[PDB]
Design a protein. Structure first.
Lengths: 125, 126
């Protein structure tokens, strides 16, 4: 599964990457502070595409992507909505973690192997 | 009129441009396949939802005037009346399509002002 990618996908990835270092804040969806679905929602809204506010809702939009076909901008939903990240290439994802670390870039593999969470959806708006 | 409040489009254009670092430079280019200097700034803003002039010279008139000390990520820096254009990304750095040998890079605004022979003729906030 390698559905059609667009400028909005690569642009959402670039906006998310530029937000690295932003604070984590419960319910946040702006540069003042993001939660996990608020960062992905914000990145796509700024690229001109509205996606649902919750990780669970983000799991149903766009086209299904297979793991090996991930491209920058793909939304990775974890354990049915427990978490959401945005793929930025090189096996890395950008995501709002917790108040101690804020918005970071880290390994998809490390999170899948050690967080206790599993990828339940990979979507390409 | 002068140094007006920035928007998400400004910070978003800066993020999109920074993500294009490593892209090839190509004469007349305005896509990830290859960019010229004004093609990169136009593309970054189009992806952030704003249409700006295609040429560096036209970008000198877009949006509002900005003074050097008030630059914020997303500000367009026009050089020698359109000879070059770059986008400020903060920390004194700008992203720009240089030439085929280096492609799109991030480099110092002060290094370019002091040694390129070019001068800032306009700083604009779309």
């Amino acid at each position: 599964l390698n559905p059609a990618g667009s400028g909005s996908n690569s642009s959402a990835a670039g906006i998310a990457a530029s937000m690295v270092g932003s604070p984590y804040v419960w319910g946040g969806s702006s540069p003042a502070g993001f939660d996990c679905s608020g960062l992905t929602s914000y990145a796509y809204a700024q690229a001109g595409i509205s996606i649902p506010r919750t990780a669970g809702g983000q799991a149903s939009v766009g086209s299904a992507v297979s793991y090996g076909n991930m491209q920058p901008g793909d939304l990775i939903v974890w354990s049915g909505g427990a978490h959401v990240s945005i793929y930025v290439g090189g096996g890395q994802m950008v995501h709002a973690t917790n108040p101690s670390t804020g918005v970071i870039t880290s390994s998809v593999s490390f999170w899948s192997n050690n967080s206790g969470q599993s990828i339940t959806a990979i979507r390409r708006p």
